Design a protein around this ligand. Structure first.
Ligand SMILES: Nc1nc2c(ncn2[C@@H]2O[C@H](COP(=O)(O)OP(=O)(O)O)[C@@H](O)[C@H]2O)c(=O)[nH]1
Lengths: 420, 37
């Protein structure tokens, strides 16, 4: 049981959710038709399994496109929360004028899906920080669900403004506005960025003609591997809360980087062996992360690992022992045995092993600082402001968002080196 | 002729007043009430 509800947001979040449901259907043996050929699905007369997946957005072209592609019959025709105007890359648009009139349609449907279960252990949001809709609308949904349900655990698979270029000109504004309302009411922010995702699909995988469905498939395989330890048996099982405890020692430093494995070349997929020491090499390799922040330029406040496949436990023991042994000061030493380990008992579709590494570390603080830097630049010199200020927002909130980001990062950095 | 130019003055006055005057939410507020109740 121990339910999940899959609310989406923005065209990004919509595509990622579509492909994630594709992956979970293809894993649980669910067709695009919705049969078997409940921890994620719901029973429906006629022998159907409907995903309790809500797609909300301020534009329907995304809605139409996600309906059009394969696996579209999964989502039932009520959870398509239709927006007609579009926030148009404006946090004020996506959070105040259209938020405060979409909140409650979403409230009725989320109460729908929440009473549909018995025990809703955790939520599920995938959205953006830069798009007006995604950012504002999504952090507003987060605030609302965290207002009524204080006992659940919040979780966002969040895409941030890209380093080399900003996807939309107001990426800094929307991103700081999203994190300022993310810190207190979002319990686990898995930080992803389109550019690092590009890097991981490019470097070791031969992919020369990539596509957004491809990156969605990658991050959705990761998104399935993070929790696949829940719905399946295992010698040493976990959940969202053992993970949350072993990951956050403080309610603030709870933003996590994620990676999934294995991922190698296909033409070279035969020449290499395939073992668990090789899995450790694969992801404790710096380049295998899904965030534009090499974690070995910082420190690991703690890190959790979740296996998939049936091998021994001698493995995971020597695993985190060996890795702590050499990359010790790459972690933080003020906390004992900072690596947590669990095992899911089932391997992936067609392959032998899977591994998911999640990390509560202090290298995303530079991501936060680069966001705040771009923000402050466009902010003092007043770049792209009337779009936010002529729609019932003031820059007092912008100042406080920027300063709050800076406060978060100041704790991140001092906790990097705090020792006793 | 005095009367026609006088109504010309009239017309001028009226076009000036038209240019001067040239210078819905209740239901959506009920919708705003529905949620809180
Ligand atoms: N991973 C991924 N990211 C996307 C995709 N489409 C858009 N994005 C990112 O999402 C951001 C757009 O945010 P969004 O909220 O959807 O825009 P909005 O709907 O106009 O407010 C951009 O910065 C893109 O980089 C996708 O298919 N996959």
């Amino acid at each position: 049981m121990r339910e999940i509800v899959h609310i989406q947001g923005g065209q990004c979040g919509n595509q990622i959710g579509a492909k994630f449901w594709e992956v979970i259907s293809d894993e649980h043996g669910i067709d695009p038709t919705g049969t078997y050929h409940n921890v994620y699905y719901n029973e429906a007369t006629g022998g159907r399994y409907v995903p309790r997946a809500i797609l909300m957005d301020l534009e329907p072209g995304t809605m139409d496109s996600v309906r059009a592609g394969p696996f579209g019959q999964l989502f039932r025709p009520d959870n398509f929360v239709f927006g007609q105007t579009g926030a148009g890359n404006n946090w004020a648009k996506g959070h105040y004028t259209e938020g405060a009139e979409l909140i409650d349609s979403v409230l009725d449907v989320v109460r729908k899906e929440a009473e549909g279960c018995d025990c809703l252990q955790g939520f599920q949001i995938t959205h953006s920080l830069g798009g007006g809709t995604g950012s504002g609308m999504g952090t507003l949904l987060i605030s609302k669900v965290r207002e009524e349900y204080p006992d659940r655990i919040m979780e966002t698979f969040s895409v941030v403004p890209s380093p080399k270029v900003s996807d939309t000109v107001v990426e800094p504004y929307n991103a700081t506005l999203s994190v300022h309302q993310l810190v207190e009411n979002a319990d686990e922010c898995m930080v992803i960025d389109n550019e690092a995702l590009y890097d991981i699909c490019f470097r070791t995988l031969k992919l020369t003609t990539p596509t957004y469905g491809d990156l969605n498939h990658l991050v959705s395989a990761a998104m399935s591997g993070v929790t696949c330890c829940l719905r399946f048996p295992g010698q040493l099982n976990s959940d969202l809360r053992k993970l949350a405890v072993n990951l956050i020692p403080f309610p603030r430093l709870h933003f996590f980087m994620i990676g999934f494995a294995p991922l190698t070349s296909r033409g070279s997929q035969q020449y290499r062996a395939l073992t668990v020491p090789e899995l450790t090499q694969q992801m404790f390799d710096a380049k295998n992360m899904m965030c534009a922040a090499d974690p070995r330029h910082g420190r690991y406040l703690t890190a959790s690992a979740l296996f998939r496949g049936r091998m021994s436990t001698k493995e995971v023991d020597e695993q985190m022992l060996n890795v702590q042994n050499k990359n010790s000061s790459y972690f933080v030493e003020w906390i004992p045995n900072n690596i947590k380990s669990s095992i899911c008992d089932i391997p992936p579709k067609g392959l032998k092993m899977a591994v998911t590494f999640v990390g509560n570390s202090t290298a995303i603080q530079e991501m936060f600082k680069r966001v705040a830097e771009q923000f402050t630049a466009m902010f003092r010199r007043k770049a792209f402001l009337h779009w936010y200020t002529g729609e019932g927002m003031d820059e007092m909130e912008f100042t406080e968002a920027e300063s709050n980001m800076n406060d978060l990062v100041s704790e991140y950095q001092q906790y990097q080196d705090a020792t006793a | 002729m005095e009367i026609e130019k006088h109504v010309v003055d009239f017309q001028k006055k009226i076009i000036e007043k038209r240019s001067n005057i040239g210078g819905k939410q209740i239901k959506i507020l009920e919708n705003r009430l529905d949620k809180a109740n």
